[PDB]
Amino acid sequence: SPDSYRSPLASRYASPEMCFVFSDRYKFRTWRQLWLWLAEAEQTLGLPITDEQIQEMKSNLENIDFKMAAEEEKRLRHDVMAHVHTFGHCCPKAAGIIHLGATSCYVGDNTDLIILRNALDLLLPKLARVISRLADFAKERASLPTLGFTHFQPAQLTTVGKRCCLWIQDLCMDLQNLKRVRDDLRFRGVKGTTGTQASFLQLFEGDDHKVEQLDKMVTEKAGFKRAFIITGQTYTRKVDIEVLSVLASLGASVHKICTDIRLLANLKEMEEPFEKRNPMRSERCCSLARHLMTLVMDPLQTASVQWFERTLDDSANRRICLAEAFLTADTILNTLQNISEGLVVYPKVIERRIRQELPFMATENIIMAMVKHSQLDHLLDPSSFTGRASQQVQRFLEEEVYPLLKPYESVMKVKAEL
Amino acid sequence: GSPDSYRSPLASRYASPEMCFVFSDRYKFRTWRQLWLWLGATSCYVGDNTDLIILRNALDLLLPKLARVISRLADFAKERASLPTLGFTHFQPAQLTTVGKRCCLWIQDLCMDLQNLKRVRDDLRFRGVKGTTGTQASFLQLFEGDDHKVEQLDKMVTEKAGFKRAFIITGQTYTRKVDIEVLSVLASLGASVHKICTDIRLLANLKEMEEPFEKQQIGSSAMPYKRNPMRSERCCSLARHLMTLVMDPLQTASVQWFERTLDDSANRRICLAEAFLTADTILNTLQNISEGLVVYPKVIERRIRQELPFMATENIIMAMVKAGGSRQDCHEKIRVLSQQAASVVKQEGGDNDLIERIQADAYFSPIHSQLDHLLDPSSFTGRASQQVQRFLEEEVYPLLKPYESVMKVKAELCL
Amino acid sequence: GSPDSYRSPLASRYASPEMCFVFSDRYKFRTWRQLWLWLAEAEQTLGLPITDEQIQEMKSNLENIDFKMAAEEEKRLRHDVMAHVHTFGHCCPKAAGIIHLGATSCYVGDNTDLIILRNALDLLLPKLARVISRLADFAKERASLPTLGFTHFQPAQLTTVGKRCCLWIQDLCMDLQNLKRVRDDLRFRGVKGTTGTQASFLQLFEGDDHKVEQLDKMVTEKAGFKRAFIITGQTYTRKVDIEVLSVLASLGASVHKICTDIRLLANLKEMEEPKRNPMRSERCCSLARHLMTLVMDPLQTASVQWFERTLDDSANRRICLAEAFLTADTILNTLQNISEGLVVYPKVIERRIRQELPFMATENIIMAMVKAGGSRQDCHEKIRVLSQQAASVVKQEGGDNDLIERIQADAYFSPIHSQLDHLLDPSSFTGRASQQVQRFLEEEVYPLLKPYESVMKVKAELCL
Amino acid sequence: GSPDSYRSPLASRYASPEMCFVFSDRYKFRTWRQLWLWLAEAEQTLGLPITDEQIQEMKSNLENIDFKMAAEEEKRLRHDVMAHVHTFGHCCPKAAGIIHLGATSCYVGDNTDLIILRNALDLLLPKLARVISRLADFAKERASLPTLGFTHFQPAQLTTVGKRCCLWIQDLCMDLQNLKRVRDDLRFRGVKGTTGTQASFLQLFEGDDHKVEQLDKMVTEKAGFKRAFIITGQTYTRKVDIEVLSVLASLGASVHKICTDIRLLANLKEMEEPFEKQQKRNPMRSERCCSLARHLMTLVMDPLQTASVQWFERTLDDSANRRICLAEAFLTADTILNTLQNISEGLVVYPKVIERRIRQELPFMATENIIDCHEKIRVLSQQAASVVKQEGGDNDLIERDPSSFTGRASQQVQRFLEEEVYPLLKPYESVMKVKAELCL
Ligand SMILES: Nc1c(C(=O)N[C@@H](CC(=O)O)C(=O)O)ncn1[C@@H]1O[C@H](COP(=O)(O)O)[C@@H](O)[C@@H]1O
Ligand SMILES: Nc1c(C(=O)N[C@@H](CC(=O)O)C(=O)O)ncn1[C@@H]1O[C@H](COP(=O)(O)O)[C@@H](O)[C@@H]1O
Ligand SMILES: Nc1c(C(=O)N[C@@H](CC(=O)O)C(=O)O)ncn1[C@@H]1O[C@H](COP(=O)(O)O)[C@@H](O)[C@@H]1O
Ligand SMILES: NC(=O)c1ncn([C@@H]2O[C@H](COP(=O)(O)O)[C@@H](O)[C@H]2O)c1N
Ligand SMILES: O=C(O)/C=C/C(=O)O
Ligand SMILES: [Cl-]
Ligand SMILES: [Cl-]
Ligand SMILES: [Cl-]
Ligand SMILES: [Cl-]
């Protein structure tokens, strides 16, 4: 409803798919999924849980009474316990075995880790598409000379495609980082209130092996290759630093790229798509990318003051910054893909600017000729001042870019939103 | 709204309804049409002036809540001005303070915030009527070259919007430096609240003080015996976000090119509202905490008894010397007895028995009868209770005076 | 110092000698001794057993600091303040027993830091005022010089060079107001004792509260502060450090925006600082950025100070306070130098206006047409087609804007051909720009500069 | 340095001599000259008109740097690189004409910075490894020692001293993995020309692309890098600076958390950092670590901002910022690791205090064994809690065996140390013996 504040990330910017990943339906559904997996594995390992209790839970995974959970939360001041009661109300037989041996972080943290990994999996293809569209552009314009800029003053010629490779390289570094974080992300698993699994050890009457099995079993049900051995109550909040640092770095890359595009628009050498002509899409990318960089200080601060086995001063902050970083990243990648699909180049403006400055950039050619008038047209040919630019493009795209794009070949065809 | 898609936690969970509506979309387009009933304009005529109206309303909602927090803590500070408590530097036992004096550390920081929020609210200027690049060229042409009519128009809508003052100089926008000034003060407030709520969480570990806890409240899903400072922890958590947010407007302002670039717009839709919604939640939550603080004097007194003996050694020597003992002998004998008591505490896990040892040693016969008086906690608190009253009267109560009519409201939490 | 070990570029390269001296260890430890002397003086006046000869001994050795011996004491004790108490007591053997009487380390640590902060603000203020003044001269001189306006960095309604300069001046004036406010409202820690209770001083004056308050007020006045805290822990509240570095961070943002504009104006060839690269402006941006970054230090520090003090503030503050001020010092000096030597190229400014103004001017041309034979509709539609033709020449052929040539050639505009020079006159497109400049400078700028009139003449030098 | 002007406490107080030397001007300008020599060497080998005597002249004067003359040239020119070219040419009069042949300032500026960063990472890695190793010894030694667990800093189910130590070790191991990765993946700028096109070098080799690639690869190997960028502007991408300072910022957070825990353990009297006999016992070393670690976290916003506003092939608004933040991040990291090593070598534990605190909370720690049950114990627990706090009494679950209460803690320690920690320490086995000294 427009009568109260609504995040522009929900109402304006981010994709439906990313919005669903950070939704409360997906969150509390996944809590129930985790409670089911715990009960399943606990029964398999010999605890007194009946087939009918398990079926009851399985039938009501998505049957979530939000109104009743809010009333319980107002009464108890504990969101996890509110949802245990609410789940126990629609599963009266199972009510007594839900959450058996566990702490709130069993559902809280593991859900957050499932969410993070799904969210990374949504970002990766979009980033790959951005890189791919820019790679097409870079190849197509590999040989098109353009005035180089250092200190934003006229400098030795480069090419439009070579400059595009500066942007592509930064984005490829981001793709490498996002892949790494996604692949190295570990599950909290089943660890108990302070990470000792003391509760589960007592439930299995001192059988260490059964405890390790339980941990490994729910880890596999959730689709993770690996779980922590060491935790406190929580997974280490250093994980949140690693994830938001990579998104912050992506922010910087996008901000630089979109800043270049905005400058190229002033120069009239290049313009973003349009369905006075302003680079509004690039400006929005910069704007949002900035927020992405800002957000890195949240998890840095959070992790630095976590006392002992956990303090709850992480919780509210994480409800805000994790979702917003991903929703912001999602919007920037979509928007940048749309930009890269529709870039318009104006070679006659590019050539005119070179003609105005190239004379100053030469003179050394004219002296070398003198040492030995009719040659002047050939000596001021812009193509000869670009050094190895077009050769650099081809070598870079082949050796460094195309191999990173290979795994996303099947999803390349999707066109952007806006 | 729905739970089938993402909602901001500040909207769904934390934010007061008034502050929610201040950053509301309906409230934004009411203000936009209010501003056109008040034509050669640019988008920022409604965009920026609405944002300035919103900021000022939002500050006006925060101010009373902060004042109430200060007032509740001031009541607490007066009530406990003389209650001795162990001082802490490096979080090690240190010269005694009082519960109320410590509360004044918190009150002072919050008063500095109230001064800052008042200042920013009062000095906030209106963009007014300025045209596409701030030259008013459109309005000058509409009034066929009459400069005076243009200045009047600017001054007139400025007054209709309820601002004392408008910029002379703008580009298309009001300078985004204004956004730095507003979020810097909220960031500083964040730091104050984080420190205070961190102290409260430590006091809970020490069992000297606890935040309010409802009859039916559950601390933990797994440990039923637990009572956690979860309200204070949430305050810290949100206060941190408030500090983080200051880098948004700092960065935004630094890269605004010429008379305006639009890379401010999306960022400002996020950070301005969220800073105010975050501040709103923390003030309401901290008010609720301060209204319900529970103190445990018996624990406070026990901790003093355990540590005071070590603090008091200089008093005991001065007494011994006054009774005609030797500073050298006295110092050396206390030193040995102190290490013995220290080893009992650390190596045996026992109580501090230094007083028991001094009573048992016949070298201190001259001062045995003085020992109750020499270890009296009231004499170790210096000027603590006098500091409280002077501070409350000279520095705190005057800042609260304008909010006297709205002090009675209690702060509710539904989670 | 020596190039064989790391030196801060803020010391070795950037900041002024005067700011460097304010954050030096000589000034620091000299001021520790000054504060110990003031404490002894006031304590004697209020009746404590301190002789005139002990006071004179301390007064004679304020500058006589054995750094080698203080380092050896610090290696043995691991306490910098106590090391310096011993070292001071070694050259003042008679006074040794009464130095630091009743005090805690923060008596010298914090009060020195507050004296340093205030001196450092007093060095920044005039430099900022001079920057504002030089830009104000420039703004007045160029108040009427039309220049292309920029929104989204696209051509937009004309402004003037002086009016644009006022955007910069305004932000810097807000900084001057902020620095003045913080300087004036800065309070002294004074004499407060280990946990801020003054318990030690109360015992020294045998329970006389009034004598304790006078001691506090007396050393506060000797240090030259109008006001002291009533409430402290061991330290002054580290919120003070947030207030100071926030204002410097905001200044950073202002300077970064201004110097970014100047760098863009250099690309446009409309303006240059004193291949020609705007390296001074680029350095200002670079350093201004560090100034903005630094604000998160004190925000974090203050937020995790437990109870009456934790020492996790100390090392951080040795770095960030000095560096913020040294960075600010360099940026202001460098920006003053830039503003003193700005070179403008009006012929380039005029050429760029000629290229774009035709597109801006269509509304004037219609109003003239309506005033002649009329039809706003026909006029609008015919200009629209001719404008797209001229636009394609600019973008697709890389040519000059020929829209005026096309309007002269089209016989529909016969009624207004003779008006065209006057209708495209840049002076009439600048709205109230020059009037805004004069009103702003008089009402808002000159009054803030008035107190710094005597120090305006100093030129800002650069050695690299 | 002299105390009459401001000096960085990172130089004058905190960081090691070795890290200070790496960020010194002697090492910087010495390395500029080294890079000019390598360029001349490779250029001669590839056929450019450079004599053996010109190369010798340069090689003899690598360390012979006239700082006074370079400052005078820099005041005259306002270009530090060109000042040093003139100054170097002044002592190698024969070579003067071929110094910097074909190159741009970033050839010496950036490549030196990349050599410095790599060396600096190589100094940090062993110190971090030693910290992890000392804590690993401690963790094994105390794997079975029960201690009160803390969540929300309230008493919670028992852990062990060694298991808690593994929380710290894990975070630090993640840092070691990150520092290794960044060190190994760091690429050289190499030889790239004013705008990264190598146009100058292409013209010098009369259009021979292959010779240009060889030159790049040759100086890259002389500098000891496996790999160089293909793509650059004038500079290496400043995103590299984000990657390096992000990892150091994350390390800062880890150290801050650890040292915060230690400071809390000191209040509880369960554990204390080392003290020097001649030194109330405060955790001042841990407090300094926190203090400096904070600065390390703060610094990450410098390179994030810098990279985001680099226009086109380069803008010079990176330069001053990088002179400050790169050195300071590494010097700050250096100090924190050395100081934390010293702390971990001297940790003192007080088991009798640990045991007493457990005895005081034990009734609550048996509730997990005993577990609508929850609700009951909750009401009876608040009743017992009020007796403790409001009446000052013992915890009484009259209202209602230590051995099971630490769960799998000691087993977790052994599995973690063996599977995850010891393998990361293996390469640093030869340098483990060094003790970490502090002078203040
Ligand atoms: N308000 C503008 C401006 C502007 O003010 N000035 C124009 C002229 C004018 O609008 O009067 C100029 O070129 O000077 N440009 C874009 N927009 C709009 O900004 C909105 C973009 O939302 P975003 O997601 O980027 O925050 C969205 O509502 C629009 O894109
Ligand atoms: N100033 C103190 C304080 C303190 O205030 N102590 C009180 C008593 C108390 O607070 O317990 C006193 O007056 O003695 N504690 C340490 N230090 C010293 O601070 C120095 C810290 O240097 P760092 O490297 O951490 O910046 C370092 O040289 C010193 O350790
Ligand atoms: N290194 C350069 C560059 C540059 O890379 N220029 C190219 C050419 C070009 O891109 O235009 C070149 O090969 O020289 N420009 C300046 N300077 C110099 O950098 C010094 C910067 O000082 P700062 O105080 O900002 O760190 C300062 O002493 C010098 O200005
Ligand atoms: N895991 C825990 O220790 C824990 N302790 C309390 N809680 C509950 O989680 C919620 C936290 O909300 P917030 O993130 O706003 O602090 C509250 O309902 C609180 O009782 C937990 N999840
Ligand atoms: O809710 C839980 O399970 C844990 C709470 C706590 O550790 O206090
Ligand atoms: Cl669990
Ligand atoms: Cl307007
Ligand atoms: Cl004092
Ligand atoms: Cl090069």
Residue numbers in the entry:
A (entry chain C): 9 to 283, 295 to 391, 437 to 482
B (entry chain B): 8 to 45, 108 to 484
C (entry chain A): 8 to 281, 295 to 484
D (entry chain D): 8 to 286, 295 to 386, 398 to 426, 445 to 484
Task: List sentences from the manuscript.
ADSL is involved in the de novo purine biosynthesis and recycling pathways in which it catalyses the conversion of 5-aminoimidazole-(N-succinylocarboxamide) (SAICAR) to 5-aminoimidazole-4-carboxamide ribotide (AICAR) and the conversion of succinyladenosine monophosphate (SAMP) to adenosine monophosphate (AMP), respectively. Both reactions are β-eliminations in which fumarate is released. Domain 1 (residues 22–112) and domain 2 form the base and one side of the active site thus creating a binding cleft for the substrate, while domain 3 (residues 365–450) resembles a lid which sits on top of the active site.
Co-crystallisation of nADSL with its other products AICAR and fumarate (AICAR/fumarate) yielded a different crystal form than seen for the apo and AMP/fumarate bound crystals. In this new crystal form, two nADSL tetramers are present in the asymmetric unit (tetramer ABCD and tetramer EFGH) in contrast to the single tetramer present in the apo and AMP/fumarate bound structures. More specifically, domain 3 is tilted by around 20–25° towards the active site in two protomers of tetramer EFGH (chains G and F) and in one protomer of tetramer ABCD (chain D). As such, the conformation of domain 3 in the G chain will be referred to as the ‘closed conformation’ in the remainder of the text while the conformation in chain F will be referred to as the ‘semi-closed conformation’. However, since domain 3 closure occurs through a rigid body movement involving two hinge points near its N- and C-terminus (Leu377 and Phe449), the central region of the domain (including residue 429) is structurally identical in all three conformations. However, in the AICAR/fumarate bound nADSL structure, Arg396 is inserted into the active site and forms part of a hydrogen bond network involving residues from domain 1 in the semi-closed conformation and the catalytic C3-loop (belonging to domain 2) in the fully closed conformation. Indeed, electron density for the C3-loop is only clearly defined in the protomers of the AICAR/fumarate bound nADSL structure where domain 3 adopts the closed or semi-closed conformation. In those active sites in which the domain adopts the semi-closed or open conformation, the reverse enzymatic reaction appeared to have occurred in the crystals since they all have substrate SAICAR bound. In contrast, the adjacent Ser290 residue directly H-bonds with the carboxyl group of fumarate thus being more favourable situated to act as catalytic base.
